[PDB]
Amino acid sequence: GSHEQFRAALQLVVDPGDPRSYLDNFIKIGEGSTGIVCIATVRSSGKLVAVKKMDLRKQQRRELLFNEVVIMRDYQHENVVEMYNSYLVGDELWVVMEFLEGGALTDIVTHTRMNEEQIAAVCLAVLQALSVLHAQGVIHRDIKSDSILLTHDGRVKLSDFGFCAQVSKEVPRRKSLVGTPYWMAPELISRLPYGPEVDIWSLGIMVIEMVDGEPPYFNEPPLKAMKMIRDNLPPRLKNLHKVSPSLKGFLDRLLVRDPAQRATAAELLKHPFLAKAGPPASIVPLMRQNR
Ligand SMILES: Clc1c(CNc2nccc(Nc3cc(C4CC4)[nH]n3)n2)ccc2nc[nH]c12
Numbered sequence: 001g002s003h004e005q006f007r008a009a010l011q012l013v014v015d016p017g018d019p020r021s022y023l024d025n026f027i028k029i030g031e032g033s034t035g036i037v038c039i040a041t042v043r044s045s046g047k048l049v050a051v052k053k054m055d056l057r058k059q060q061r062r063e064l065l066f067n068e069v070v071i072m073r074d075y076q077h078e079n080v081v082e083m084y085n086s087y088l089v090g091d092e093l094w095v096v097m098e099f100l101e102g103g104a105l106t107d108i109v110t111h112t113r114m115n116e117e118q119i120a121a122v123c124l125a126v127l128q129a130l131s132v133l134h135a136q137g138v139i140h141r142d143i144k145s146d147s148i149l150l151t152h153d154g155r156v157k158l159s160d161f162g163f164c165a166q167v168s169k170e171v172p173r174r175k176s177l178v179g180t181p182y183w184m185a186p187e188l189i190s191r192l193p194y195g196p197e198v199d200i201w202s203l204g205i206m207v208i209e210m211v212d213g214e215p216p217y218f219n220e221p222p223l224k225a226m227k228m229i230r231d232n233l234p235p236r237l238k239n240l241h242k243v244s245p246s247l248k249g250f251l252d253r254l255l256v257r258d259p260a261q262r263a264t265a266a267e268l269l270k271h272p273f274l275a276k277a278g279p280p281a282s283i284v285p286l287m288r289q290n291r
Pocket residue numbers: 029030031032036037050051052097098099100101102103104146147149159160
């Protein structure tokens with residue numbers, strides 16, 4: 001009776017019907033922890049969409065599925081992935097999204113070296129989105145190269161909102177252990193009450209990704225790496241001699257063990273380093289089909 005409960009609940013927030021009646025040429029392109037992703041054609045228009053499919057019976061924490069729909073619906077932005085519709089289909093939650101041709105950022109950071117014009121342009125894109133989200137007390141909790149999508153012209157959008165949490169006056173902090181281990185904030189790992197600050201930490205770790213190609217302690221097992229993140233100091237860049245004083249100083253405002261002294265999105269938007277940010281055109285050279 002618990003599963004039927006969630007179905008009905010989810011049924012009340014999604015759009016009615018079955019999208020299979022108006023979609024064609026389903027083509028699987030990926031698989032996350034929460035489910036798989038297909039591209040498909042909207043028959044009536046020939047436009048392409050992306051369809052994320054998530055089994056209700058295959059979730060670690062069902063109640064998180066509302067984030068999949070609710071977040072994208074309430075926050076539109078140049079830097080946030082567009083959602084067109086959501087449906088309940090069988091025992092699956094389908095989300096129909098904008099299709100970002102350029103794929104995830106992770107494919108870039110592992111196969112190439114981004115320059116600081118490119119790195120700055122990414123950070124600006126994320127911080128602009130995080131600023132709006134943080135403003136309404138929403139924590140993303142899964143900031144990393146995986147959660148960043150790109151277009152053909154190098155526009156950048158924040159994705160994967162399934163791990164979101166809301167804070168407010170009656171709920172000032174969150175306490176649950178959420179996110180991807182290496183990108184997690186020290187206060188969150190330590191199981192202390194946390195807020196939006198943890199997102200700024202993760203971004204820092206994601207900046208390490210863009211420079212070193214991987215996060216700190218990435219060769220270690222996840223549980224052991226988490227322990228290291230907690231006890232140790234802010235992690236180092238293995239290629240620090242390759243980053244500018246500008247980038248370093250900026251990063252030093254991200255990777256702060258005390259969330260109180262850790263910078264905020266709104267503050268970071270005004271940082272000198274983000275002035276280096278080039279146009280979307282500067283990101284184009286880095287994508288798989290181009291390089
Ligand atoms: Cl499976 C998976 C993908 C899908 N793989 C993929 N490959 C090439 C292009 C492309 N573009 C997209 C994607 C989307 C909406 C998210 C579904 N719209 N356009 N997506 C992406 C990031 C992930 N991070 C973790 N798992 C991820």
